Design a protein around this ligand. Structure first.
Ligand SMILES: [Cl-]
Ligand SMILES: [Zn+2]
Ligand SMILES: [Zn+2]
Ligand SMILES: [Zn+2]
Length: 116
DNA sequence: TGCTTCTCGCGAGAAGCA
DNA sequence: TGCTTCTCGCGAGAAGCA
């Protein structure tokens, strides 16, 4: 196998046999275990780097295009990810984006083709 | 440094199957 | 197909470099 189950109080966890990490969702555990097996590879279309998770590759690639999908709605400035946007708003606007705040807009990804 | 890269539950599309 | 199963984007707190 790649995991074993661990049931406490009827709550089911899925444990990675390699690093004993705990996962509520099995799909989560798979996504993780690929970093141990490298069974699937996610090569960047723009350079030679390869990634063990699809989302790593996607963040990387969007970084290649320079696209700025995250826009502060308080002053209009755009940012390439959640952390720059959040850091901006907290610091400049002394406000917290977390939750249904409507303090930022996430634009569709246009600089390359991903799910939407 | 307060500010890349990591983490994974959640659920919406995409792919697989019939 | 319409039904299910799978993929992975996303938030946002956390760990990690330097
Ligand atoms: Cl842009
Ligand atoms: Zn593991
Ligand atoms: Zn690349
Ligand atoms: Zn702003």
């Amino acid at each position: 196998d790649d995991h074993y189950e661990l049931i406490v109080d009827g709550r089911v966890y899925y444990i990675c046999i390699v690093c004993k990490r705990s996962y509520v969702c099995l799909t989560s555990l798979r996504r993780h275990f690929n970093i141990h097996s490298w069974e699937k590879k996610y090569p960047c279309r723009y350079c030679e780097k390869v990634f063990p998770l699809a989302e790593y590759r996607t963040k990387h690639e969007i970084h290649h295009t320079g696209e700025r999908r995250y826009q502060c709605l308080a002053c209009g400035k755009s940012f390439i990810n959640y952390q720059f946007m959040s850091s901006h708003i907290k610091s400049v606007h002394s406000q917290d984006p977390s939750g249904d705040s409507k303090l930022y807009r996430l634009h569709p990804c246009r600089s390359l083709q991903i799910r939407q």
